[PDB]
Every structure is written in C-alpha cells, then in structure tokens.
Swiss-Prot record:
It comes from Homo sapiens. This is Zinc finger protein 224. A zinc finger (C2H2-type) spans 13-35. Signal peptide: none annotated. Belongs to the krueppel C2H2-type zinc-finger protein family. It is found in: Nucleus. Interacts with WT1. Interacts with DEPDC1A. May be involved in transcriptional regulation as a transcriptional repressor. The DEPDC1A-ZNF224 complex may play a critical role in bladder carcinogenesis by repressing the transcription of the A20 gene, leading to transport of NF-KB protein into the nucleus, resulting in suppression of apoptosis of bladder cancer cells.
Length: 46
C-alpha cells in the first residue's frame, strides 16, 4: 500500500518472495533462486 523507509517504489518486475526490484524478467528470476535451498538439482544446480 505505502512505504517510507525505502526508495524503489514500483517496478515492471519484482521478486515475489521479498519484493526485490528488477527491469528484465530473466533478472527477477535469477535472484528469486536465492529463495531456494531444500531442493534436488537435476538438469541444473545452484
Ligand atoms: Zn526475493
């Protein structure tokens, strides 16, 4: 709704976990990864 102790208002692409800010979808996801640890790695591993 509103904020004060923050600068980045709104962005075209932000994280769903915390709410980070991004400009390109690809980027948004990249970070989103961090929000994952207890998971198996098959075709790709962090
Ligand atoms: Zn996040």
């Amino acid at each position: 709704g509103s904020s004060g102790s923050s600068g980045s208002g709104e962005k075209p692409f932000k994280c769903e976990e915390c709410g980070k800010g991004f400009y390109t979808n690809s980027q948004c996801y990249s970070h989103q990864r961090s929000h994952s640890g207890e998971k198996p790695s098959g075709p790709s591993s962090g």
